[PDB]
């Protein structure tokens, strides 16, 4: 990052990066891990696995 | 040429190979409604329900 750039956002207008307000350090904002929960299960009358 | 007593019959041939490119399937995509509004916030979920 250039010395004068404070934060930045991605194409979705969500903030992907930030500069340390105390010391001089540059940190990216990476959202917490996610994905979809896929359930592989037989019918309710078969089992609960 | 067009005549009643005239006919044309081929004396030789050739074997031609052509190409037609036909699509079968597209990319499977699934978009979440809540994460498309925002994540890690209950304001998007209460106002979205």
UniProtKB/Swiss-Prot annotation, chain A:
Glycosylation sites: 45
Origin superkingdom: Viruses
Record function comment: Attaches the virion to the cell membrane by interacting with host receptor, initiating the infection. The major receptor is host ACE2. When S2/S2' has been cleaved, binding to the receptor triggers direct fusion at the cell membrane. When S2/S2' has not been cleaved, binding to the receptor results in internalization of the virus by endocytosis using host TFRC and GRM2 and leading to fusion of the virion membrane with the host endosomal membrane. Alternatively, may use NRP1/NRP2 and integrin as entry receptors.
Quaternary state and interactors: Binds to host ACE2. RBD also interacts with the N-linked glycan on 'Asn-90' of ACE2. Cleavage of S generates a polybasic C-terminal sequence on S1 that binds to host Neuropilin-1 (NRP1) and Neuropilin-2 (NRP2) receptors. Interacts with host integrin alpha-5/beta-1 (ITGA5:ITGB1) and with ACE2 in complex with integrin alpha-5/beta-1 (ITGA5:ITGB1). May interact via cytoplasmic c-terminus with M protein. May interact (via N-terminus) with host bilirubin and biliverdin, thereby preventing antibody binding to the SARS-CoV-2 spike NTD via an allosteric mechanism.
The protein's name in its UniProt record: Spike protein S1
Protein source organism: Severe acute respiratory syndrome coronavirus 2 (2019-nCoV)
Taxonomic lineage: Viruses, Riboviria, Orthornavirae, Pisuviricota, Pisoniviricetes
The gene coding this protein: S
Residues of the full protein shown: 559 to 607 of 1273
């Amino acid at each position: 990052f250039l010395p004068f750039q404070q934060f930045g956002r991605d194409i979705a207008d969500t903030t992907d990066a930030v500069r340390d307000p105390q010391t001089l350090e540059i940190l990216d904002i990476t959202p917490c891990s996610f994905g979809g929960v896929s359930v592989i299960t037989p019918g309710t009358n078969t089992s609960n696995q | 040429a067009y005549s009643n007593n005239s006919i044309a019959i081929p004396t030789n041939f050739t074997i031609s190979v052509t190409t037609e490119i036909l699509p079968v399937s597209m990319t499977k995509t699934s978009v979440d409604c809540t994460m498309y509004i925002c994540g890690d916030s209950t304001e998007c979920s209460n106002l979205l329900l």
